[PDB]
């Protein structure tokens, strides 16, 4: 499912992402936009064999186990397939661990590149 901006914002809000660890919700909507374009099914295979899954493009050598990635640390103790669901709960649940583990939102390359130090609330205004 390809969420709508304001649709994803509402779903993330309900899933407790607003001001999570202090990150206003616009951070989460912008990350999701430049990570997966709001497509909960997006997968991107990487040069090291690993693949990025879901709406927040979570990676298989460290966060989830997809079965075809050598050395998967699987830090989220979850299959990668649980992140391609239209129900962002697993993704949101894992995104919290990444963030609460001290990585910050820097863990998302797209956020650090297209959102950090930008007017992120632009991403939720009008919903």
């Amino acid at each position, epitope marked *: 499912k390809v969420f709508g901006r304001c649709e994803l914002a509402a779903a993330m809000k309900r899933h407790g992402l607003d001001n999570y660890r202090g990150y206003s919700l616009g951070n989460w909507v912008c990350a999701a936009k430049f990570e997966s374009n709001f497509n909960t099914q997006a997968t991107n295979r990487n040069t090291d*064999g690993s693949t990025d899954y879901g709406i927040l493009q979570i990676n298989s050598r460290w966060w989830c186990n997809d079965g075809r990635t050598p050395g998967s640390r699987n830090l989220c103790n979850i299959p990668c397939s649980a992140l391609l669901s239209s129900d962002i709960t697993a993704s949101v649940n894992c995104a919290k661990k990444i963030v609460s583990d001290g990585n910050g939102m*820097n863990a998302w390359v797209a956020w650090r590149n297209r959102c950090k130090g930008t007017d992120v609330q632009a991403w939720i205004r009008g919903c």
Partner: nanobody
Framework: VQLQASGGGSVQAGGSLRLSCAAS????????MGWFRQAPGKEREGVAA????????YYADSVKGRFTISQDNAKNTVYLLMNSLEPEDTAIYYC??????????????????????????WGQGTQVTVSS
């Protein structure tokens, strides 16, 4: 966390040297380990990086073809084999790690080529001097 480099010294132009770096005190990671060098009177240069585990490598255009970075795993140990050493390679070599466990795929040579962004943990420098 600790980073302990080894190797370095002096050698004649044309010879080779092998540096090493073991990250210690890590529970998870590092995501990246690489090498930087501060030649006398020049800008700090990002030399080579490797994506821990995944194993992808990146090299500065100067050292491309001559250096080779690899990992022994274990205590997050990596090596830089330096062949065809020229006196221009004389500099202080620093080991560096990026402790962030990225959510999405991050290519380590990204922070290396752009000022060492992301490489938070640094080690002691090791002088390498190429004679002749």
């Amino acid at each position: 966390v600790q980073l302990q480099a080894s190797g370095g010294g002096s050698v004649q132009a044309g010879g080779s040297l092998r540096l090493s770096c073991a990250a210690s005190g890590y529970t998870i990671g590092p995501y990246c380990m690489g090498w930087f060098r501060q030649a006398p009177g020049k800008e700090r240069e990002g030399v080579a990086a490797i994506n821990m585990g995944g194993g992808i490598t990146y090299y500065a255009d100067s050292v491309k073809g001559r250096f080779t970075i690899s990992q022994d795993n274990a205590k997050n140990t990596v090596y830089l084999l330096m062949n065809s050493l020229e006196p221009e390679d004389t500099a202080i070599y620093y080991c560096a790690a990026d402790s962030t466990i990225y959510a999405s795929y991050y290519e380590c040579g990204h922070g290396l080529s752009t000022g060492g962004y992301g490489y938070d943990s640094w080690g002691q420098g090791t002088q390498v001097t190429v004679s002749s």
